[PDB]
Amino acid sequence: SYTMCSGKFSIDKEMAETQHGTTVVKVKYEGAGAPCKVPIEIRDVNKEKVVGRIISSTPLAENTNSVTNIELEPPFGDSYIVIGVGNSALTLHWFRK
Amino acid sequence: SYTMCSGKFSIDKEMAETQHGTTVVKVKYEGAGAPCKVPIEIRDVNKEKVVGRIISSTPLAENTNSVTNIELEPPFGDSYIVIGVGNSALTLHWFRK
């Protein structure tokens, strides 16, 4: 249906907590082959994948220069959010008490 | 850790059944940014993501042109293995009697 985006993402709005438990971040897609899927991995303190943690519906870069809203529910402890692929990828961090 | 590849993959040796209950494939990475983790998704007949079926510990492409070996446990029935990102990602069908 869609494959995962090859290209670069930049941060459009800095990650912030919502009124509910949640975290939101906005990214802008700079690459090609859109529409395509935003690659998102959430990892724990060890290097491990955490599933089921993504609130936003199946998240997509519609176009080059489109903007995607990603809402997550980070797990307890330290977590890292990896957006995109390659050297270009953005690696984010969150702490939940 | 390493990020997922961004580059193109080709098929070094097509997927084949094992003596045990698995298949194996070799893919060659023609992209840059290695070392990088081979992006692998296993999907079902409904094209839905199926989890827990990658046998090999997280497959890597060490270098450009490096060849790789992936051992997977395909679901019974029709399944689809998507390797890589973007327009250039390989899509593979397997059928398990």
UniProtKB/Swiss-Prot annotation, chains A, B:
Summary of subunit composition and partner proteins: Homodimer; in the endoplasmic reticulum and Golgi. Interacts with protein prM. Interacts with non-structural protein 1.
Record's subcellular location: Virion membrane; Host endoplasmic reticulum membrane
Full protein: residues contained: 577 to 673 of 3387
Disulfide-linked positions: 5-36
Entry protein name: Envelope protein E
Cited function: Binds to host cell surface receptor and mediates fusion between viral and cellular membranes. Envelope protein is synthesized in the endoplasmic reticulum in the form of heterodimer with protein prM. They play a role in virion budding in the ER, and the newly formed immature particle is covered with 60 spikes composed of heterodimer between precursor prM and envelope protein E. The virion is transported to the Golgi apparatus where the low pH causes dissociation of PrM-E heterodimers and formation of E homodimers. prM-E cleavage is inefficient, and many virions are only partially matured.
Domain of life: Viruses
PTM annotation, UniProt: N-glycosylated.
Membrane topology annotation: Multi-pass membrane protein
